[PDB]
């Protein structure tokens, strides 16, 4: 390794593509505390993806936002991320909302 | 450096 | 990890796939850097020869960050633009100095009758 | 003499190892007219990159729902995807780009994606 995963996560950050919580656990896990340039393009790599999928997650709750521009309940979230655009696993989808009780503050804390 | 950006006005004939 | 990734690909990497993902990274590769990975490698690449085209962008941005911050230092106007007179101050002074008709026709050539975008131009340049 | 730049800037962007599509072609046109300055050459440029940028991310989701991975899609279905994901367009220009590719109801969203 080169460089501390918490320097690599701030360089994320500041490139406007922010590290999940999970992806920080994970990268540690598998490199340690500290990445070569190869890891550190891999763990970019990651981050991209986090970004991406957050926007493409808020977008798909706007294409069902009918309801003016307020949220959706837990039952029709979870419908929208497995059975509709299988985004995540029953399991996942189940266990990620239990961490609540709008949609664009749920993507970016799943982050 | 500035030599790049010369060379390269150059190439362009 | 992606959400939404389906399950093919392999069998190498076509380069525009490649170019895109360096941009996703915060890069941007130019046709030249995209020339000389085709005149290596071909049109697509292995996932080593794919981290050698990223190293290739990554000495790019760069040296169009060191070009971009050493026109800024010129920038009196505030922000963002240079005129051809301050341009061609820079070009006729220093290096392999162009001339002063050789400074003209590259800046005539380029745009704006007395404003120039130096940081589009760094980019072309490159 | 001056027989209009587009058709020359197209011409340079594909010696550059750059495919301006039909669509590249006529969105330019519609910006700035039948000539181009250096300037606005070299964001059309930058358009053509976007546009395949943005082509892209769509060929990533037209996969995501091709379940039985079969290469096809129904028109309705990526109606839905054209309009909510990457650069969104409107429901008009959707089935519009749509009904020109056409003839079939299932598209080969591959083909598709590399015509527009």
Same mark, same amino acid.
């Given at each position: 390794?080169?460089?501390? /995963?918490?320097?690599?996560? *701030?360089?994320?950050?500041?490139?406007? +593509?922010?590290?999940?919580? $999970? @992806?920080?656990?994970? /990268? =540690? @896990? +598998?490199?340690?505390?500290?990445?070569?340039?190869?890891?550190?393009?891999?763990?970019?790599?990651?981050?991209? *993806? @986090? =970004?991406?999928?957050?926007?493409?997650?808020?977008?798909? &709750?706007? *294409? &069902? @936002?009918?309801?003016?521009?307020?949220?959706?309940?837990?039952?029709?979230?979870?419908? /929208?991320?497995?059975?509709?655009?299988?985004?995540? $696993?029953?399991?996942?989808?189940?266990?990620?909302?239990?961490? &609540?009780?709008?949609?664009?503050? &749920?993507?970016?804390? /799943?982050? | 450096?500035?030599?790049?950006?010369?060379?390269?006005?150059?190439?362009?004939?």
């Amino acid at each position: 390794g080169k460089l501390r /995963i918490e320097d690599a996560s *701030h360089n994320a950050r500041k490139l406007g +593509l922010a590290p999940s919580s $999970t @992806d920080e656990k994970k /990268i =540690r @896990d +598998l490199y340690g505390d500290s990445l070569t340039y190869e890891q550190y393009l891999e763990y970019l790599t990651m981050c991209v *993806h @986090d =970004r991406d999928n957050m926007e493409e997650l808020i977008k798909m &709750f706007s *294409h &069902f @936002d009918n309801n003016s521009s307020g949220f959706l309940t837990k039952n029709q979230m979870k419908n /929208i991320l497995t059975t509709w655009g299988d985004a995540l $696993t029953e399991q996942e989808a189940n266990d990620a909302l239990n961490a &609540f009780s709008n949609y664009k503050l &749920f993507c970016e804390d /799943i982050l | 450096s500035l030599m790049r950006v010369q060379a390269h006005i150059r190439k362009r004939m």
